[PDB]
Amino acid sequence: MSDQEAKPSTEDLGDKKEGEYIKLKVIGQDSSEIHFKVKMTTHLKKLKESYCQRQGVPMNSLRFLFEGQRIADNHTPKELGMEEEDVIEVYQEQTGG
């Protein structure tokens, strides 16, 4: 939650070579399927902010979890046991009141 910070890294293009990075997909609270490419040994934080910006919503309004575990900014895909084309679950933690 406190890791609700982010920076402008919008996808302008997708012209680049691959290497050691994997792909992951997110299911948003609105069934928002976001696709992103991140390293195995990098922080999930960039992934979380990356998909949040895709939807155009703050990271504090939604919940990022996998296999029933919250994803922290210091959490990594490799440590959480993820791989290429893996999928993460996102819910809404906004408020109706």
Swiss-Prot record:
Listed SUPFAM superfamilies: Ubiquitin-like
Compartment(s) where it occurs, according to its Swiss-Prot or TrEMBL record: Nucleus membrane; Nucleus speckle; Cytoplasm; Nucleus, PML body
Keyword GTP-binding (UniProt): no
Covalent cross-link (Glycyl lysine isopeptide (Gly-Lys) (interchain with K-? in acceptor proteins)), residues: 97
Chain spans, region (Microbial infection) Interaction with Tula hantavirus: 16-25, 37-40
Chain ranges of the Ubiquitin-like domain: 20-97
Pfam families given in the database record: Rad60-SLD
MF terms (GO), sorted A to Z: enzyme binding; potassium channel regulator activity; protein tag activity; RNA binding; small protein activating enzyme binding; transcription factor binding; transporter activator activity; ubiquitin protein ligase binding
Record PTM: Cleavage of precursor form by SENP1 or SENP2 is necessary for function. Polymeric SUMO1 chains undergo polyubiquitination by RNF4.
Keyword tags: Acetylation, Cell membrane, Chromosomal rearrangement, Cytoplasm, Host-virus interaction, Isopeptide bond, Membrane, Nucleus, Phosphoprotein, Ubl conjugation, Ubl conjugation pathway
UniProt GO cellular component terms: cytosol; glutamatergic synapse; nuclear body; nuclear membrane; nuclear pore; nuclear speck; nuclear stress granule; nucleolus
GO term, biological process aspect, one: negative regulation of DNA-templated transcription
Disease linkage: Non-syndromic orofacial cleft 10: A birth defect consisting of cleft lips with or without cleft palate. Cleft lips are associated with cleft palate in two-third of cases. A cleft lip can occur on one or both sides and range in severity from a simple notch in the upper lip to a complete opening in the lip extending into the floor of the nostril and involving the upper gum.
Family to which this protein belongs: Belongs to the ubiquitin family. SUMO subfamily.
Chain's role: Ubiquitin-like protein that can be covalently attached to proteins as a monomer or a lysine-linked polymer. Covalent attachment via an isopeptide bond to its substrates requires prior activation by the E1 complex SAE1-SAE2 and linkage to the E2 enzyme UBE2I, and can be promoted by E3 ligases such as PIAS1-4, RANBP2 or CBX4. This post-translational modification on lysine residues of proteins plays a crucial role in a number of cellular processes such as nuclear transport, DNA replication and repair, mitosis and signal transduction.
The name this protein goes by in its record: Small ubiquitin-related modifier 1
Organism whose genome encodes this protein: Homo sapiens
